[PDB]
Amino acid sequence: HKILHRLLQD
Amino acid sequence: HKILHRLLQD
Amino acid sequence: NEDMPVERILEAELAVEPNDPVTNICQAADKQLFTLVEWAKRIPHFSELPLDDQVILLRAGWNELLIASFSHRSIAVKDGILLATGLHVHRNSAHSAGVGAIFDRVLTELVSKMRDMQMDKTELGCLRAIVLFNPDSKGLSNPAEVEALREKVYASLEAYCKHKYPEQPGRFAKLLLRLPALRSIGLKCLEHLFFFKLIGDTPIDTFLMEMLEAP
Amino acid sequence: EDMPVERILEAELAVENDPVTNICQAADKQLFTLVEWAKRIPHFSELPLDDQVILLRAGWNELLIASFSHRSIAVKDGILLATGLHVHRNSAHSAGVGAIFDRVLTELVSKMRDMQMDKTELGCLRAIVLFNPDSKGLSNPAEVEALREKVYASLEAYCKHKYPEQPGRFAKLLLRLPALRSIGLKCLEHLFFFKLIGDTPIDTFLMEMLEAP
Ligand SMILES: C=CCc1ccc(O)c(-c2cc(CC=C)ccc2O)c1
Ligand SMILES: C=CCc1ccc(O)c(-c2cc(CC=C)ccc2O)c1
C-alpha cells in the first residue's frame, strides 16, 4: 500500500 | 414477535 | 446508586447463572434468549417501560448481551468458551468449523481483556445494563427515558469502580471502551447467524429464528 | 503532561450530480489530511511505521466519520464535506443511501449537537479511536493500550474541569464510540459495494484503504 507509507514519511 | 411478547408479559 | 443500585444489577446476573460447534452455539443462544428476558426483567426499571420498548431494546441488544455474558463466563477457560449449556468450545473446533476468525476476535478483544482486568460480575451486569438501555435503538417511544436509565447505570458503575477499585482511576473507562469491540463483534456474529440461516445446514430454534427476522 | 489535550486540540485546528461521488471525492481528499492530523498527535509519530499503518488503515473511517459529523453540528438536515460541499438528507435519500445517512445524523451529529461537544472532546475521541489496541498485527498493543489510556485519563480530567456540572459527561462521550463503530462498518460496506459495481469513481488514496491486506 504505497501512498500511505510515503505520507507517514514527512 | 410471538415469544418475546409472551415471555415479557407474565 | 439509589435509583439504579449495583447490588440489584448483580442480583439479576446471579439470578440467571447457568456436535457441530456452531450448532451448539445456536442452541446455546436459544436457551439463552429465554433467560435474557428474566435477567432484563430483573434490571431496575426495565419492566416499567412500555412493552413495545422492552421488545425493541431486546431485539436490538440480544447479541452483545449474550456475547458479553459468555465472554466473561470464559475467563476460567484457556482457549475456548464456556457455553451456558455446560459445554466448552475450543478455538480449534471453531477454526475447524470455519468460525475461526470471529472466535479469535472473541478470544482477543473480549475474553482476554475481561481477564487481564479481573472484570467482576457487577461490572459485567452494569455493562450489560448499558447495552440493554440503548437509546439509538430505532423505534423507541421515548429514547430519552432509555438514555436516563443509561445514565443511571453508568453513574452507578463509575461510583462502584471508584469505591471498590480506587487504585484504578481509569477502570471505568476501560469497561466502556470494551463496547466498540462488543458492538463490532456482535455485528459479525449476526452476519454469520444470517449466513447459517441463508445456507440451510444449521438447526435454528424458534426464539433465535424470531430474533433473526426483519422488523 | 503525558497526554496534553491542547496538542490534541492543536491537531484538530491544524488540518481543519451524484452526492455519493462527492462523498467519495471528499473521502480520498480527507485521507491525506488525516495522515497529517495523526502525525500531529502525541506519541503517534514515534510508534513504528508498520503500527502507524495498521492504526490508520483500521481507524480512518471512524476517524473521518467523526470529523464530518462534528463539522455538521451547524447544518439543519445534511452533512458538510471538506470540499466545501453540503449533502442534504433528501439528496442522500434520492441517491439510495438514506438509511446510513440518517444514522449518522441521529446517533452522531444530533448527539454531538445536543451535548455541545467541543473540538477538544472530539479530538480526544478520535485520538482514542486512532489508538485502538484491538488492531490486528500490532507489534506492541501494550504500548497502544497505554497511549489510549493516557488520552482518556486526560479526557476525564478535562471533562471534570471544563464541564464539572455534568458528572456523566465523560462517559456520555465515550458512549458514542460503539455507535461510531457500528456506523463505521455499515458505512465501509457501502464503499466496498460502490467499488464492486464500479458506478462511482474512486480515487487512488481511497482505493488503497479499501484494498486487501
Ligand atoms: C450463549 C450464547 C451463545 C451465542 C450467542 C450469540 C451469538 O451470536 C453466538 C455466536 C458466536 C460465534 C463465535 C463464537 C464465540 C459465532 C456465531 C454465533 O452465533 C453465540
Ligand atoms: C468528508 C467525509 C468523507 C467520508 C469519509 C468516510 C466515509 O465512510 C464516507 C462515506 C459516507 C457514506 C454515507 C454518508 C454519511 C457513504 C460512503 C462513504 O464512503 C465519507
XYZ file of C-alpha atoms and ligand atoms in Angstrom:
488
model
C 0.000 0.000 0.000
C 2.242 2.775 -1.431
C 0.648 6.215 -0.852
C 0.203 5.798 2.913
C 3.861 4.871 3.551
C 5.118 7.840 1.528
C 2.929 10.183 3.586
C 3.812 8.768 7.020
C 7.252 9.985 5.968
C 7.438 13.800 6.482
C -42.560 -11.424 17.633
C -44.673 -14.061 19.376
C -42.291 -15.441 22.034
C -40.730 -12.173 23.255
C -44.125 -10.529 23.959
C -45.364 -13.694 25.722
C -42.231 -14.008 27.852
C -42.220 -10.326 28.811
C -45.871 -10.264 29.939
C -46.232 -12.810 32.764
C -26.887 4.277 43.193
C -30.212 4.921 44.962
C -32.330 4.883 41.771
C -30.279 2.164 39.991
C -28.467 0.015 42.595
C -25.390 -2.035 41.659
C -26.441 -4.678 44.210
C -29.648 -5.411 42.261
C -27.854 -5.340 38.915
C -25.580 -8.090 40.243
C -28.634 -9.931 41.621
C -30.022 -10.075 38.074
C -26.724 -11.621 36.951
C -26.644 -14.016 39.899
C -30.323 -14.832 39.331
C -29.614 -16.110 35.812
C -26.327 -18.013 36.355
C -26.366 -21.307 34.365
C -21.738 -31.855 17.542
C -21.023 -29.079 15.027
C -19.625 -26.320 17.298
C -21.823 -23.724 15.556
C -24.951 -25.902 16.135
C -24.032 -25.928 19.837
C -23.539 -22.165 19.803
C -27.000 -21.598 18.272
C -28.796 -23.976 20.688
C -26.989 -22.151 23.499
C -28.091 -18.800 22.007
C -31.691 -20.072 22.008
C -31.635 -21.320 25.586
C -30.029 -18.010 26.493
C -32.659 -15.787 24.916
C -35.412 -17.049 27.276
C -33.143 -16.405 30.244
C -32.031 -12.970 28.994
C -35.679 -11.907 29.311
C -35.713 -12.796 33.049
C -32.336 -11.094 33.511
C -33.702 -7.911 31.934
C -36.941 -8.152 33.963
C -34.649 -8.058 36.998
C -32.807 -4.948 35.773
C -34.225 -1.999 37.759
C -36.982 -0.112 35.912
C -36.915 -2.352 32.833
C -40.445 -3.761 33.266
C -41.817 -0.230 33.896
C -41.022 0.723 30.275
C -43.745 0.477 27.577
C -43.998 -3.174 26.469
C -43.032 -2.296 22.864
C -39.818 -0.576 24.027
C -38.844 -3.686 26.048
C -39.283 -5.641 22.801
C -37.196 -3.146 20.782
C -34.301 -2.920 23.262
C -34.014 -6.725 23.409
C -34.430 -7.132 19.641
C -31.527 -4.681 19.386
C -29.324 -5.789 22.264
C -29.599 -9.517 22.472
C -26.463 -10.034 20.583
C -23.942 -8.032 22.515
C -25.792 -9.091 25.558
C -25.414 -12.869 25.052
C -21.846 -12.431 23.778
C -20.864 -10.252 26.790
C -22.077 -12.872 29.275
C -20.375 -15.931 27.706
C -17.136 -13.971 27.201
C -16.954 -13.209 30.929
C -18.023 -16.800 31.573
C -14.975 -17.896 29.569
C -12.193 -16.239 31.612
C -11.732 -19.512 33.546
C -11.042 -21.434 30.313
C -7.741 -21.186 28.430
C -8.526 -21.430 24.692
C -12.284 -21.610 24.184
C -15.648 -20.538 25.554
C -17.911 -21.882 28.245
C -21.405 -22.099 26.803
C -24.356 -21.774 29.188
C -25.342 -25.349 28.287
C -22.293 -26.630 30.197
C -20.308 -27.215 27.024
C -16.891 -25.857 26.019
C -15.888 -24.713 22.539
C -12.123 -24.826 21.896
C -10.721 -22.444 19.272
C -9.644 -25.444 17.169
C -13.240 -26.681 16.972
C -14.105 -23.103 15.947
C -11.434 -22.921 13.235
C -12.399 -26.436 12.059
C -15.918 -25.008 11.764
C -14.975 -22.012 9.620
C -15.791 -19.653 12.507
C -12.098 -19.397 13.482
C -11.632 -15.656 12.875
C -14.705 -14.388 14.774
C -13.993 -16.797 17.627
C -10.472 -15.385 17.664
C -11.999 -11.900 17.745
C -13.998 -13.128 20.772
C -10.835 -14.535 22.397
C -8.595 -11.482 21.835
C -10.922 -8.468 22.098
C -13.318 -9.714 24.788
C -12.422 -12.712 26.995
C -8.709 -11.907 27.366
C -9.456 -8.288 28.234
C -12.071 -9.292 30.825
C -9.393 -11.494 32.440
C -6.495 -9.011 32.258
C -8.561 -6.547 34.290
C -10.335 -9.083 36.535
C -13.747 -7.718 35.499
C -16.235 -8.743 38.174
C -19.904 -9.809 37.899
C -21.151 -6.325 38.886
C -19.101 -4.629 36.161
C -20.426 -7.237 33.741
C -24.008 -6.621 34.897
C -23.520 -2.862 34.597
C -22.051 -3.113 31.087
C -24.922 -5.405 30.076
C -27.356 -2.916 31.633
C -25.820 -0.167 29.472
C -26.196 -2.338 26.342
C -29.829 -3.078 27.248
C -30.652 0.621 27.633
C -29.632 1.609 24.089
C -31.154 4.981 23.052
C -30.050 4.526 19.466
C -32.417 1.686 19.008
C -34.852 2.566 16.352
C -38.482 2.703 17.084
C -38.396 3.633 20.786
C -41.416 5.591 22.042
C -39.225 7.627 24.420
C -35.470 7.324 23.680
C -34.758 9.939 26.408
C -36.160 7.695 29.192
C -33.865 4.904 27.947
C -30.981 7.420 27.958
C -31.885 8.475 31.514
C -31.547 4.845 32.637
C -28.340 4.501 30.633
C -27.073 7.497 32.661
C -28.245 5.849 35.909
C -26.490 2.547 35.091
C -23.146 4.159 34.215
C -23.309 6.627 37.097
C -23.695 3.652 39.448
C -20.980 1.659 37.683
C -18.435 4.508 37.876
C -19.255 5.026 41.546
C -18.840 1.273 42.150
C -15.434 1.270 40.424
C -14.372 4.409 42.331
C -15.454 2.830 45.623
C -14.197 -0.746 45.161
C -11.195 -0.261 42.836
C -9.807 3.154 43.937
C -6.284 2.241 42.757
C -7.570 2.097 39.153
C -8.636 5.661 38.186
C -9.259 4.605 34.574
C -11.040 1.289 35.183
C -14.500 2.742 34.487
C -13.412 3.958 31.022
C -11.638 0.634 30.288
C -15.013 -1.108 30.776
C -16.854 1.337 28.486
C -14.212 1.014 25.760
C -14.930 -2.723 25.602
C -18.196 -1.737 23.889
C -16.854 -0.933 20.444
C -15.354 -4.474 20.461
C -18.675 -5.880 21.705
C -20.734 -3.957 19.156
C -18.235 -4.774 16.410
C -18.099 -8.487 17.215
C -21.860 -8.558 17.831
C -22.391 -7.446 14.229
C -20.026 -10.085 12.858
C -21.739 -12.871 14.801
C -25.064 -11.611 13.464
C -23.710 -11.607 9.907
C -22.689 -15.251 10.412
C -26.042 -16.101 12.022
C -27.764 -14.813 8.856
C -25.484 -16.899 6.675
C -26.140 -20.046 8.716
C -29.821 -19.188 8.158
C -29.409 -18.346 4.423
C -27.469 -21.548 3.835
C -29.767 -24.217 5.255
C -27.466 -26.505 7.253
C -27.658 -25.212 10.836
C -30.541 -26.033 13.245
C -32.054 -22.726 14.370
C -34.645 -22.670 17.169
C -37.829 -20.573 17.317
C -36.520 -17.773 19.573
C -33.226 -17.440 17.676
C -35.219 -17.501 14.441
C -37.700 -14.884 15.685
C -34.689 -12.679 16.516
C -33.203 -13.313 13.059
C -36.356 -11.866 11.481
C -36.574 -8.463 9.761
C -38.536 -5.948 11.927
C 1.748 16.461 30.756
C 1.916 12.961 29.278
C -1.104 13.378 27.033
C -1.996 17.033 26.726
C -5.455 17.980 25.429
C -4.018 21.214 23.963
C -1.714 19.381 21.499
C -4.645 17.121 20.546
C -6.820 20.237 20.048
C -3.960 21.814 18.059
C -4.020 18.768 15.764
C -7.743 19.394 15.178
C -7.254 23.118 14.367
C -4.196 22.448 12.182
C -5.859 20.332 9.494
C -9.247 21.843 9.935
C -24.966 15.317 -9.705
C -24.350 12.234 -7.510
C -23.798 13.015 -3.790
C -22.025 9.662 -3.314
C -19.412 10.705 -5.896
C -18.929 13.906 -3.872
C -18.768 11.985 -0.601
C -16.196 9.609 -2.145
C -14.338 12.611 -3.621
C -14.143 14.257 -0.182
C -13.056 10.953 1.412
C -9.943 10.460 -0.700
C -9.190 14.119 -0.023
C -9.529 13.923 3.761
C -7.398 10.792 3.787
C -4.288 12.891 3.093
C -5.269 15.451 5.761
C -5.922 12.573 8.219
C -2.352 11.316 7.899
C -1.282 14.915 8.673
C -3.642 15.009 11.645
C -2.294 11.733 13.112
C 1.338 12.895 12.791
C 0.405 15.905 14.980
C -0.993 13.546 17.672
C 1.340 12.959 20.698
C 3.475 9.789 20.530
C 1.816 8.581 17.301
C 4.748 9.513 15.045
C 7.088 7.678 17.420
C 5.277 4.340 17.072
C 6.882 2.052 14.469
C 5.795 2.733 10.867
C 4.020 -0.648 10.497
C 1.939 0.025 13.619
C 1.206 3.541 12.304
C -0.064 1.999 9.041
C -2.162 -0.570 10.930
C -3.807 2.195 13.055
C -4.865 4.470 10.175
C -6.000 1.548 7.955
C -8.072 0.389 10.942
C -9.360 3.789 12.021
C -9.663 6.107 9.023
C -13.438 5.635 8.608
C -14.388 6.208 12.222
C -11.770 8.987 12.378
C -13.215 10.549 9.222
C -16.852 9.938 10.101
C -16.416 11.620 13.474
C -14.883 14.669 11.788
C -17.661 15.350 9.290
C -20.283 14.551 11.940
C -18.817 17.294 14.144
C -18.385 19.711 11.254
C -22.114 19.136 10.615
C -23.293 20.304 14.087
C -24.132 23.555 12.288
C -26.440 22.363 9.481
C -30.141 21.550 9.971
C -30.550 18.360 7.893
C -27.458 17.401 5.956
C -23.715 16.969 6.293
C -20.919 19.355 5.371
C -17.944 17.981 3.448
C -14.367 19.323 3.478
C -14.603 20.014 -0.264
C -16.961 22.835 0.851
C -19.905 20.784 -0.451
C -23.099 20.072 1.518
C -25.008 16.797 1.212
C -28.647 17.179 2.237
C -30.815 14.471 3.821
C -33.154 14.462 0.780
C -30.215 14.430 -1.627
C -28.756 11.396 0.172
C -32.128 9.661 0.195
C -32.560 10.334 -3.524
C -29.186 8.626 -4.139
C -30.186 5.469 -2.260
C -28.055 5.970 0.875
C -30.686 7.439 3.232
C -30.507 4.585 5.754
C -26.902 5.142 6.869
C -27.079 8.943 6.384
C -29.938 9.117 8.916
C -27.942 7.046 11.434
C -25.029 9.492 11.153
C -27.473 12.379 11.718
C -29.413 10.996 14.729
C -26.733 8.975 16.577
C -23.683 11.142 15.927
C -24.494 14.604 14.558
C -27.534 15.085 16.794
C -25.880 13.734 19.924
C -22.850 15.907 19.240
C -25.159 18.931 18.772
C -27.198 18.085 21.905
C -24.186 17.988 24.237
C -22.249 20.815 22.547
C -19.205 18.562 22.238
C -16.156 20.790 21.851
C -13.238 20.213 19.461
C -11.042 19.029 22.348
C -13.566 16.324 23.241
C -13.888 15.385 19.562
C -10.093 15.279 19.135
C -9.528 13.023 22.135
C -12.283 10.671 20.969
C -10.623 10.426 17.555
C -7.293 10.003 19.393
C -8.906 7.167 21.355
C -10.135 5.681 18.057
C -6.708 6.216 16.489
C -5.097 4.283 19.349
C -7.148 1.088 19.003
C -5.191 -1.655 20.857
C -7.606 -4.202 19.341
C -5.980 -3.642 15.927
C -4.665 -6.898 14.437
C -0.972 -7.366 13.664
C 0.258 -4.627 16.014
C 3.862 -5.142 17.160
C 3.143 -3.557 20.525
C -0.542 -3.464 21.643
C 0.603 -2.923 25.254
C 2.006 0.429 24.117
C -1.161 1.272 22.181
C -3.267 0.263 25.202
C -1.132 2.624 27.320
C -1.436 5.547 24.890
C -5.224 5.337 24.605
C -5.288 5.130 28.408
C -3.263 8.373 28.593
C -5.678 10.057 26.155
C -8.851 9.171 28.066
C -7.333 9.880 31.501
C -6.586 13.341 30.136
C -10.148 13.401 28.783
C -11.665 12.718 32.191
C -9.571 15.493 33.800
C -10.739 17.978 31.147
C -14.406 16.899 31.420
C -14.198 17.220 35.228
C -12.536 20.646 34.849
C -14.323 22.272 31.894
C -17.826 20.899 32.495
C -17.757 19.932 36.197
C -21.558 20.453 36.439
C -22.224 17.380 34.285
C -20.728 14.311 36.082
C -21.977 11.930 33.377
C -20.285 13.822 30.544
C -17.035 11.807 30.372
C -18.956 8.528 29.980
C -21.506 10.078 27.600
C -18.665 10.964 25.178
C -17.075 7.508 25.136
C -20.586 6.073 24.772
C -20.754 7.439 21.206
C -17.965 5.029 20.305
C -19.998 1.839 19.956
C -22.256 3.938 17.673
C -19.311 5.321 15.657
C -18.004 1.732 15.363
C -21.360 0.428 14.120
C -21.718 3.386 11.721
C -18.110 2.963 10.535
C -18.659 -0.642 9.446
C -22.042 -0.019 7.816
C -20.511 2.958 6.015
C -17.493 0.854 4.924
C -19.783 -1.816 3.384
C -21.250 0.886 1.115
C -17.759 1.781 -0.105
C -16.998 -1.849 -0.978
C -20.237 -2.045 -2.943
C -19.556 1.313 -4.697
C -16.314 -0.319 -5.840
C -17.752 -3.735 -6.860
C -20.409 -2.155 -9.128
C -17.853 0.437 -10.345
C -20.619 3.034 -10.862
C -18.742 5.620 -8.810
C -15.184 6.852 -9.468
C -12.891 6.112 -6.523
C -9.599 7.987 -6.295
C -6.200 6.401 -5.596
C -5.777 7.005 -1.838
C -9.346 5.899 -1.041
C -8.830 2.871 -3.282
C -5.726 1.955 -1.255
C -7.636 1.817 2.065
C -10.399 -0.497 0.824
C -7.905 -2.772 -0.937
C -6.782 -6.024 0.728
C -4.026 -6.821 3.258
C -24.605 -18.481 24.934
C -24.845 -17.855 23.660
C -24.037 -18.241 22.586
C -24.070 -17.242 21.413
C -24.956 -16.166 21.369
C -24.940 -15.298 20.277
C -24.044 -15.492 19.227
O -24.059 -14.627 18.185
C -23.144 -16.559 19.252
C -22.220 -16.817 18.217
C -20.847 -16.890 18.492
C -19.920 -17.180 17.477
C -18.421 -17.242 17.792
C -18.211 -17.958 18.966
C -17.708 -17.314 20.090
C -20.353 -17.408 16.167
C -21.717 -17.343 15.882
C -22.640 -17.059 16.898
O -23.959 -17.013 16.588
C -23.179 -17.422 20.355
C -15.913 14.136 4.335
C -16.164 12.709 4.704
C -15.920 11.801 3.639
C -16.233 10.352 4.052
C -15.363 9.662 4.892
C -15.648 8.348 5.256
C -16.795 7.716 4.782
O -17.034 6.436 5.159
C -17.677 8.394 3.936
C -18.837 7.775 3.442
C -20.101 8.107 3.947
C -21.259 7.491 3.445
C -22.650 7.851 3.998
C -22.731 9.208 4.297
C -22.592 9.645 5.611
C -21.158 6.532 2.433
C -19.902 6.198 1.923
C -18.754 6.816 2.427
O -17.545 6.481 1.922
C -17.380 9.714 3.576
